[PDB]
Amino acid sequence: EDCINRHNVYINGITYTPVSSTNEKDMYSFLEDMGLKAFTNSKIRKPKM
Amino acid sequence: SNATTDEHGLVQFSINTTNVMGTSLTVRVNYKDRSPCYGYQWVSEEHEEAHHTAYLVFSPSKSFVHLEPMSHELPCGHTQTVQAHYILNGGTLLGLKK
Ligand SMILES: *[C@@H]1O[C@H](CO)[C@@H](O)[C@H](O)[C@H]1NC(C)=O
Numbered sequence: 001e002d003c004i005n006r007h008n009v010y011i012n013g014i015t016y017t018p019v020s021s022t023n024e025k026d027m028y029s030f031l032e033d034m035g036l037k038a039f040t041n042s043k044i045r046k047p048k049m
Numbered sequence: 050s051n052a053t054t055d056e057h058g059l060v061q062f063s064i065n066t067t068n069v070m071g072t073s074l075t076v077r078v079n080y081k082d083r084s085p086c087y088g089y090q091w092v093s094e095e096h097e098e099a100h101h102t103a104y105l106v107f108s109p110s111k112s113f114v115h116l117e118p119m120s121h122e123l124p125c126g127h128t129q130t131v132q133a134h135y136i137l138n139g140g141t142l143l144g145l146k147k
Pocket residue numbers: 050051052
């Protein structure tokens with residue numbers, strides 16, 4: 001469920017810029033391409049908005 | 050923050066900003082447009098609304114002084130202490146005594 005999408009992205013500093021989906025490997029993905037599945041409460045997947 | 054017109058005074062209002070460069074204000078703000086389902090150019094009921102759009106100082110230092118406008122009466126052959134209020138963001142990083 002975790003949607004971290006702001007109204008405006010709140011990109012403080014010198015300038016603002018919009019949101020975008022990343023591209024990187026994940027512990028979720030490590031257990032996926034491993035082949036198996038798991039249940040756990042800790043932060044495994046990335047917080048995809 | 051609603052207000053009311055004083056007999057001697059107009060609306061003199063502030064709004065605390067904690068947001069981004071693009072900002073736009075208005076009063077009589079029951080809507081943005083009346084209810085534009087259609088008019089088919091017959092006639093449009095249009096009362097006046099004072100909507101304003103403003104923009105920001107592009108200050109990467111974020112340290113600046115705001116100068117209120119003295120757009121009122123002015124007797125000549127005088128001096129006039131201008132009223133200005135400022136900030137320094139991050140304090141001064143090193144700065145100096147002066
Ligand atoms: C207008 O603002 C005053 C000041 O806080 C508040 O007490 C009052 O409830 C407001 N009036 C309205 C429209 O309720």
